[PDB]
Design a protein around this ligand. Structure first.
Ligand SMILES: Nc1nc(Nc2ccc(S(N)(=O)=O)cc2)nn1C(=O)c1c(F)cccc1F
Length: 274
């Protein structure tokens, strides 16, 4: 159960747009921290409309279930504000933000080893979720958050965390799931009850394509109807700009869910590319 945070201890400072039936803000939390030290902590606030009851329930159950699993590559949730007409997730603010935006702002001037390190970290996170039989369901480059940039002097790689799952595809409207092709796998377009650990293996492939494509979105030129037909016709994505991961992407984006490799196997594959 999430720690409750009082509306009175939250300041909203900056609008950061919208997620899927969410409004996102940067703000500050006034808290009592380690040793009774008063802190003013930068926070990321995700606001759900209480009137969208099934969406909110799904969102906060997903966030809660994953926050029960502390992990270096999973975002820290501080708690929730049940304040009136809205329920608010209070989350750590990750300094360098979403990986797709990061790659655009840096004009894809990162080398293949940087991409491999981020891919490995994501794979380790997903391996941990797989061992805990916890489906994420919204793996994508925008939900990869950069804590730290690479430091060439120390050899430190970039360091990432994976965002909270959001509203489950089992409750979202079909048109939203179709918009989310090709992150949502074909079996889930067919029936959202086909959600399975296999789902995240497919989406991991799509996310690798993003990482290797400088933050481009695959199939952006296709509308919801032509994306649904892209699966009906069983097409695969084009090889990304950095072709080094093309084989791994194809192996993960397997139309047969049971053939998608384990994240343990995926990690070994990534290691062998170096
Ligand atoms: N927890 C979290 N921290 C951030 N850091 C952030 C956000 C925006 C910027 S900006 N306006 O480009 O300069 C810079 C740093 N994002 N974040 C999220 O969960 C998050 C997400 F996963 C997807 C989309 C939006 C988010 F907000």
């Amino acid at each position: 159960v999430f720690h409750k945070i009082r509306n009175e201890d939250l300041i909203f400072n900056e609008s950061l747009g919208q997620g899927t039936f969410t409004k996102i803000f940067k703000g500050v939390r006034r808290e009592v921290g380690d040793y009774g030290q008063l802190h003013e902590t930068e926070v990321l606030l995700k606001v759900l409309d209480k009137a969208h009851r099934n969406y909110s329930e799904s969102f906060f159950e997903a966030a809660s279930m994953m926050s029960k699993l502390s992990h270096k590559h999973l975002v820290l949730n501080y708690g929730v504000c049940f304040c009136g007409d809205e329920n608010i997730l209070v989350q750590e603010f990750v300094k360098f933000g979403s990986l797709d935006t990061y790659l655009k702002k840096n004009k894809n001037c990162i080398n293949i080893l940087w991409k491999l390190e981020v891919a490995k970290q994501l794979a380790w996170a997903m391996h941990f979720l797989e061992e805990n039989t916890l489906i994420h369901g919204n793996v994508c480059a925008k939900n990869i958050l950069l804590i730290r940039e690479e430091d060439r002097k120390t050899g430190n790689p970039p360091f990432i965390k994976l965002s909270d799952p959001g509203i489950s595809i089992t409750v979202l409207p079909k048109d939203i799931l179709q918009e989310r092709i090709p992150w949502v796998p074909p079996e889930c377009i067919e029936n959202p009850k086909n959600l399975n650990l296999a789902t995240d293996k497919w989406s991991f492939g799509t996310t690798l394509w993003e990482i290797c494509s400088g933050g481009d979105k695959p199939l952006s030129a296709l509308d919801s109807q032509r994306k649904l037909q892209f699966y009906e016709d069983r097409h695969q994505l084009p090889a990304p700009k950095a072709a080094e991961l093309a084989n791994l992407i194809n192996n993960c984006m397997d139309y047969e869910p049971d053939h998608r490799p384990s994240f343990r196997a995926i990690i070994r594959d990534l290691n062998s590319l170096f």
